[PDB]
């Protein structure tokens, strides 16, 4: 009542295809194609949560420079004394985004904050 299979070849062609552009044996050699697959998914997690964290970082430093451009000692620190004291509903470090597109606008923001 032999019951032999082929469902491996599909089980495994699928992976064989998800691991393309893997530049070594990591793209040919099934028995390692598997663990590679696993490890790409894992780094997809860690790089995803770390991407939220990472883009905050990038905007903090970018807005921080735009503010320090005022030649007097301002900061990304003190800009937020003054940006929450005056009720501005959280421009969400995307004032760091216009700060590079509409810089004159960000100088308008900044002057209204100083008042």
């Amino acid at each position: 009542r032999v019951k032999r299979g082929y469902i491996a070849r599909r089980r495994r062609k699928k992976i064989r295809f998800f691991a393309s552009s893997f530049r070594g044996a990591h793209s040919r050699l099934t028995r390692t194609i598997a663990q590679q697959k696993i490890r790409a998914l894992v780094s997809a997690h860690r790089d995803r949560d770390r991407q939220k964290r990472d883009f905050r970082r990038l905007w903090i430093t970018r807005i921080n420079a735009a503010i320090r451009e005022r030649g007097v000692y301002y900061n990304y620190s003190k800009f937020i004394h003054d940006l929450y004291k005056r009720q501005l509903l959280l421009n969400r470090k995307i004032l760091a985004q216009i700060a590079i597109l509409n810089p004159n606008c960000i100088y308008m923001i900044y002057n209204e904050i100083i008042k």
């Binding site: 696993i38 308008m108 002057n111 209204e112």
Partner: peptide, 28 residues
Amino acid sequence: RRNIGHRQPITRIKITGITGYEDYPAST
């Protein structure tokens, strides 16, 4: 190990116009 996926049900809005921004302009 857990092979699981996820579809965030997004909504693709288009924006037609903007209105009532006349009051208290702070532009300069």
